[PDB]
């Protein structure tokens, strides 16, 4: 019921906005006007449809031209973006190099089995008995699957995504302790195998998030 009611409304604005475009063009017969027609134009094609429905979100983007303050702050944001780019390039290059190093280090080593008893995919097959909450008197049958970490270092793009998630300081201890247990190319984890591999994560965090992200804010302030 609500969508149909809002559907009738959508017809009204398009009629008004088309009327506005014609009269404005009539007396004026830049790229801001292109955006004004683009928002109204895509609506008239309506009335794959999902892409058009997503694209119709451009409605409030054309209120920038109608307000001097909004336009001024948008131009200020763009100017701030333009001056920054030297820092972004260096940060992106360093993050790409760290992603390459992480690929060389933990390539495919983050795999593990559903039960912490099978250390290779050749025997991580079939069913196994799982004990709920560690109690021996409450067993349940489960399937064991040779799974992979959600944020791994299998290729360069995956390494970049994992390092970005680390640089956002979200879930980085989990990745740290997953890489500490990283044993080999196609074998399961070992408890505290190489604690010394934490130097990679510590150095990356210190270099990027602590240092080159504070240079970002400091240079914006300057």
């Amino acid at each position: 019921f609500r969508n149909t009611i809002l559907g009738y409304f959508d017809y009204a604005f398009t009629a008004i906005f088309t009327v506005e475009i014609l009269l404005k063009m009539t007396t004026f017969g830049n790229y801001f006007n292109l955006l004004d027609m683009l928002v109204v134009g895509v609506s008239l094609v309506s009335f794959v449809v999902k892409i058009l429905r997503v694209l119709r979100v451009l409605r409030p983007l054309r209120a920038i031209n109608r307000a001097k303050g909004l336009k001024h702050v948008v131009q200020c944001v763009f100017v701030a973006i333009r001056t920054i780019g030297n820092i972004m390039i260096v940060t992106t290059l360093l993050q790409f190099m760290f992603a390459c190093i992480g690929v060389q280090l933990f390539k495919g080593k983050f795999y593990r089995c559903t039960d912490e008893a099978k250390s290779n995919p050749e025997e991580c097959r079939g069913l196994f008995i799982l004990y709920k909450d560690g109690d021996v008197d409450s067993p349940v049958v489960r399937e064991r699957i040779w799974q992979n970490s959600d944020f791994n270092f299998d290729n360069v793009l995956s390494a970049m995504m994992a390092l970005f998630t680390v640089s956002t300081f979200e879930g980085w201890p989990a990745l740290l302790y997953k890489a500490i247990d990283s044993n080999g190319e196609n074998i399961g984890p070992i408890y505290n195998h190489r604690v010394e591999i934490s130097i990679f994560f510590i150095i990356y965090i210190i270099i990027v998030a602590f240092f080159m992200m504070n240079i970002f804010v400091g240079f914006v302030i300057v």
């Binding site: 979100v57 409030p60 983007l61 909004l70 702050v73 948008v74």
Partner: peptide, 13 residues
């Protein structure tokens, strides 16, 4: 009050 408007517009979109 316009940077907050920019943030609100980003959140809305």
């Amino acid at each position: 009050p316009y940077v907050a408007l920019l943030i609100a517009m980003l959140f809305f979109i």
